[PDB]
Design a protein around this motif. Structure first.
Motif: not given
Ligand SMILES: CCCCCCCCCCCCCC(=O)OC[C@H](COP(=O)(O)OCC[N+](C)(C)C)OC(=O)CCCCCCCCCCCCC
Ligand SMILES: CCCCCCCCCCCCCC(=O)OC[C@H](COP(=O)(O)OCC[N+](C)(C)C)OC(=O)CCCCCCCCCCCCC
Ligand SMILES: CCCCCCCCCCCCCC(=O)OC[C@H](COP(=O)(O)OCC[N+](C)(C)C)OC(=O)CCCCCCCCCCCCC
Ligand SMILES: CCCCCCCCCCCCCC(=O)OC[C@H](COP(=O)(O)OCC[N+](C)(C)C)OC(=O)CCCCCCCCCCCCC
Ligand SMILES: CCCCCCCCCCCCCC(=O)OC[C@H](COP(=O)(O)OCC[N+](C)(C)C)OC(=O)CCCCCCCCCCCCC
Ligand SMILES: CCCCCCCCCCCCCC(=O)OC[C@H](COP(=O)(O)OCC[N+](C)(C)C)OC(=O)CCCCCCCCCCCCC
Ligand SMILES: CCCCCCCCCCCCCC(=O)OC[C@H](COP(=O)(O)OCC[N+](C)(C)C)OC(=O)CCCCCCCCCCCCC
Ligand SMILES: CCCCCCCCCCCCCC(=O)OC[C@H](COP(=O)(O)OCC[N+](C)(C)C)OC(=O)CCCCCCCCCCCCC
Ligand SMILES: CCCCCCCCCCCCCC(=O)OC[C@H](COP(=O)(O)OCC[N+](C)(C)C)OC(=O)CCCCCCCCCCCCC
Ligand SMILES: CCCCCCCCCCCCCC(=O)OC[C@H](COP(=O)(O)OCC[N+](C)(C)C)OC(=O)CCCCCCCCCCCCC
Ligand SMILES: CCCCCCCCCCCCCC(=O)OC[C@H](COP(=O)(O)OCC[N+](C)(C)C)OC(=O)CCCCCCCCCCCCC
Ligand SMILES: CCCCCCCCCCCCCC(=O)OC[C@H](COP(=O)(O)OCC[N+](C)(C)C)OC(=O)CCCCCCCCCCCCC
Ligand SMILES: CCCCCCCCCCCCCC(=O)OC[C@H](COP(=O)(O)OCC[N+](C)(C)C)OC(=O)CCCCCCCCCCCCC
Ligand code: NA
Ligand code: NA
Ligand code: NA
Ligand code: NA
Ligand code: NA
Ligand code: NA
Ligand code: NA
Ligand code: NA
Lengths: 221, 221, 221, 221
Positions: B168, B172, B177-178, C151, C179-185, C188-189, D181
């Motif tokens: 994962y 990323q 991204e970041s 969902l 997309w990851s740090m801001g939305i999908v991570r 996933m919590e 963001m």
């Protein structure tokens, strides 16, 4: 006896057996990731690993007699050689970097299997007609790294305090990652014209990248 | 009676009717999103939905008699079959994933309508000449995921604690991204040479993506 | 008198004069940005603006008599027409959106000047051979927007609470922005398998984009 | 005596000597970065630097007698001239920008060395067939910068308060860096339709970049 071993080494069985161990060792390496797996089948896997590397040193030794000077003039063999030697260095001592670089031996799957060789070969053959542009780029970074260091390092040590930190930061800006919100907006709070440094930097570095990609598109065609 | 139904199924009316229901069901699926719409026209739409899926099971059953063995050898028919079967599974039970995968039947608009098939077909036919590169890439991620897990997972569990977490995170990083502000700058606060791992990773993974696209540009030509 | 005006309208002077006003109005529009400039030369510029739009309504009226039906079948004239009409709507009333859309008249610089027409024309002519892919993409977004809404919208209203918010968010993910740090991570919590939704989404949407660009590269060639 | 110097200047030794100083000065410029190195070998390097620039003014003076009018009609010579003149301006006075622009003389490595000239030449020759698109783009930014300034500058001064700030912010959005963001999600908290401004902006600006690259791919072929 030369020919006796040469017909072993050259056999399909020999190669298939080796590839079989690659995939097996590869799978077992991922299992060694689990703390749970290692508290159960820990010793099973640890012994299994010392077994495989033995089979591979033999393999490399057998291959060398069969090929002699030709072996050490084969990129794929050299890779095979160096990746197995890395794996040979004792479990402790020095640092554990070596213990980790061991997993690089799974790239023997590219070596042992053709078609993989084909793609890797194709990908690599593109690199020579890039080095002039790469060289230009590296000179470019070096020149801007030095400028950034002496323009921003005093008040922004983490990012530009050092030639290396500046290389790193300039690389990051090139990938366009947080270049504005994270680096150049903060910089402008002290140096309102910082944008005169980074915008032209981004244009050049992007322009080059586009050209570099165009190169590979036109040259392969 | 075989031919009697075959002239129904094979007709222009039949297809136009089905496409008409797709667009109708698609529109109705988007309205089922509104909490407001559902307190009003809730039952109206709920009944409308069980009606359409019935009409679609009939359709699939009719299509199967008319095509028999040819039906289950048609990619598009199989899709139609599987996407309608998903939609058949009862409202409750297990999880609500099935209720959601139901909306996938709007891709039936691609099946039922030509010209759409063409583009999907065109896009897909490009995928075979990629699998070697995809395979190379997948091996690549796997080797680096394992390295990252055992190099960074102890002190950075959320990002690298587990092989899957490392896959994962590495993904990323590939999207850029970041990768620096969010992952590699923090990692370097403990492991100052983490950059020796991620910069070469970013180079390789980027290089390949560039080549992969070049492939499709030159190969499509 | 038709020919008398037709030789005015058709003249180089006429066109050059109009282009001259475009550039002049364009410059003055940027000056209207400064609060300082407007406290000094405010009225100077305000009157200057009502002057230009008059000269332009005349111009459009003159052009229509000379071209009649041909005028309203010319994309460039229609643009000229609609952009001047926008600019005609009274200073107040309704909303100030119209007051701002006025600045769009600087695109008359593309209209009035050839070569600009050429690039815009070239850029546009590429769009028809894209609509099938665009259509596919829009259907795709619509289907995933609905899935994401039902969902994730309950527990993540800002991002997925509504079909539109989901479209917006999915667009953002497509640009790969946070997309990851801001939305999908964060997602996933609560939903550890959210990655099964967004990774395949990103692959498809990226794959298409690559193909779409390849299309234009091969088709223009 | 003309020819006496012309055989010096035109010689292999002469060029090799100059390139030798470039690389030497370049290396020395990177060491002037270290605070440590400067407290030790500070004066050593400071004198070394005034020596090289003298050797380079001589070189430029010699080159001018040998080439006269041809010198100032050579892009590469002009660069050499201007980059050395920058380096000539006294250590203090005005600002230290000049002290920093000094490091630009390392681009003399591109001048002095062929093969480098070639790539720079190749990269540059691509730029003419772009200026129409660049012009279109610049007009585009200017029109949207003005709109954004008067739509968002009042409540969002840092990002849009000023035409220049809007240019900057719009540029950042084009690189897609934090556009949602960091900029558009916050804007929408006050202006829920801000998305009607930035999504079409992102589409247009992306489309063009894609075309611009396609241009270079097809046109270079
Ligand atoms: C050529 C590469 C030159 C490598 C180099 O100069 O090292 C600089 C840095 C490492 O320096 P260092 O300051 O020790 O480490 C980073 C900061 N720290 C200590 C907090 C971790 O390491 C870097 O990050 C430099 C690597 C990024 C620059 C890579 C070269 C880019 C130019 C060409 C790439 C595009 C061409 C296709
Ligand atoms: C090859 C193209 C890219 C190369 C461009 C390099 C240009 C570097 C831009 C400078 C960015 C910021 C540098 C800087 O020092 O900050 C701005 C300074 C004001 O601060 P400064 O006077 O340095 O003193 C610091 C005091 N403090 C902390 C209270 C501010 O005041 C300034 O530095 C103003 C700078 C404006 C002039 C720069 C424009 C020249 C472009 C280069 C043209 C020749 C090469 C193409
Ligand atoms: C080639 C096919 C591509 C299709 C193009 C896709 C364009 C769809 C645009 C929909 C965007 C509107 C979303 C939006 O505004 O917010 C979400 C709202 C929820 O608001 P809400 O306040 O909860 O209640 C709405 C009240 N009502 C029902 C009386 C209107 O809820 C809604 O607005 C529901 C509206 C759904 C209408 C969607 C119609 C698209 C046609 C689908 C064609 C293909 C079907 C297979
Ligand atoms: C954005 C992508 C969404 C995909 C929508 C899902 C509907 C598609 C289901 C399967 C479609 C099969 C497409 C296809 O090209 O068939 C594979 C080859 C070529 O078929 P062909 O015989 O050329 O027709 O034999
Ligand atoms: C052309 C370019 C192609 C690139 C090829 C590499 C693509 C790999 C994409 C990685 C996808 C990925 O996110 O892997 C996640 C899975 C799930 O592991 P898991 O630890 O359960 O989930 C991680 C997130 N968590 C813990 C918060 C729930 O972790 C795994 O199970 C790893 C297996 C995924 C490999 C699929 C490759 C085909
Ligand atoms: C030399 C080529 C060999 C290729 C064979 C690779 C097949 C799979 C390798 C074995 C991986 C075993 C799964 C695993 O290690 O679980 C780790 C965590 C759960 O650990 P945990 O429950 O925390 O234990 C404590 O759970 C996870 O992190 C998710 C499970 C990871 C997915 C496995 C990734 C397969 C990638 C496919 C590579 C194909 C290369 C061509
Ligand atoms: C052509 C590419 C050039 C690089 C190829 C290999 C070069 C090997 C150079 C490595 C030498 C330095 C690495 C090293 O010292 O290990 C650093 C750490 C291990 O922990 P360590 O720094 O010893 O512990 C400090 C933290 N503490 C005290 C709080 C526990 O762990 C790390 O983070 C090191 C970062 C990983 C880099 C090590 C090599 C992996 C790269 C393999 C793939 C490279 C491209 C294919
Ligand atoms: C086709 C475009 C469909 C537009 C649409 O459905 O509207 C959805 C949203 C606006 O909905 P709305 O919920 O009213 O506003 C956003 C959230 N809010 C209220 C907090 C500001 O507006 C959007 O953000 C949708 C625009 C992004 C999707 C654009 C379509 C992407 C598919 C094709 C693009 C790539 C093909 C080359
Ligand atoms: C085609 C040309 C491309 C050139 C390739 C560029 C690669 C340059 C790599 C330099 C990266 C090293 C940066 C770094 O490690 O941190 C910055 C340090 C500051 O550390 P510091 O603790 O302050 O003191 C250093 C102590 N000393 C002098 C006794 C060694 O300060 C330094 O390390 C200064 C070292 C500068 C050496 C640079 C040599 C590059 C040759 C330039 C060739 C072209 C010239 C025109
Ligand atoms: C990364 C870019 C850094 C640039 C380094 C700065 C040194 C270059 C200064 C000017 C170079 C002029 C290059 C050039 O192509 O001349 C323009 C045309 C073609 O020259 P040509 O006659 O083909 O030789 O007539
Ligand atoms: C191919 C793609 C080409 C794209 C063409 C558009 C590129 C425009 C790039 C925008 C560059 C930019 O950042 O503009 C900044 C300047 C400075 O205005 P200024 O308000 O003084 O500085 C803004 C930052 N601040 C306030 C914190 C100091 O603001 C201005 O003065 C605007 C003039 C720059 C236009 C240059 C276009 C050539
Ligand atoms: C129809 C085509 C016409 C093209 C002509 C454009 C030439 C320049 C237009 C006039 C702009 C005047 C500068 C300006 O408005 O200052 C604004 C702020 C200072 O305002 P401030 O001091 O805060 O006043 C209160 O200071 C700034 O924000 C920085 C100054 C903005 C730079 C001007 C941007 C020129 C872009 C070039 C466009 C070329 C199109 C082909
Ligand atoms: C094909 C593309 C489709 C769009 C083309 C034009 C469509 C026009 C639709 C605009 C209708 C809604 C815009 C609007 O209501 O203005 C919203 C705000 C103005 O402030 P407003 O929302 O009235 O004040 C609320 C905040 N308050 C109460 C605290 C003061 O200001 C805004 O943020 C509006 C956002 C700007 C969009 C307005 C049109 C500019 C786009 C022109 C370029 C589009 C592509 C070329
Ligand atoms: Na900000
Ligand atoms: Na920051
Ligand atoms: Na930082
Ligand atoms: Na972080
Ligand atoms: Na995190
Ligand atoms: Na967030
Ligand atoms: Na948010
Ligand atoms: Na922000």
């Amino acid at each position: 006896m030369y020919l006796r071993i040469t017909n072993i080494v050259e056999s399909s069985f020999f190669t298939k057996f080796i590839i079989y161990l690659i995939v097996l060792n590869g799978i077992t390496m991922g299992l060694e990731t689990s703390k749970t797996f290692m508290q159960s089948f820990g010793v099973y896997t640890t012994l299994f690993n010392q077994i495989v590397i033995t089979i591979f040193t033999i393999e490399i030794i057998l291959r060398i007699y069969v090929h002699r000077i030709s072996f050490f003039k084969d990129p794929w063999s050299l890779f095979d050689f160096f990746v197995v030697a890395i794996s040979l260095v004792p479990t402790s001592s020095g640092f554990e970097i070596l213990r980790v670089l061991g997993v690089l031996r799974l790239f023997r799957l590219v070596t042992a299997v053709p078609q993989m060789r084909k793609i890797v070969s194709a990908l690599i053959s593109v690199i020579p007609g890039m080095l002039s542009v790469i060289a230009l780029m590296t000179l470019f970074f070096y020149i801007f790294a030095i400028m950034a260091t002496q323009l921003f390092g005093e008040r922004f040590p983490e990012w530009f305090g050092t030639l290396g930190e500046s290389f790193y930061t300039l690389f990051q800006v090139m990938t366009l990652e947080s270049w504005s919100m994270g680096i150049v907006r903060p910089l402008m709070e002290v140096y309102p014209y910082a944008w005169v440094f980074f915008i032209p930097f981004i244009f050049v570095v992007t322009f080059v990248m586009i050209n570099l990609v165009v190169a590979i598109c036109v040259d392969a065609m």
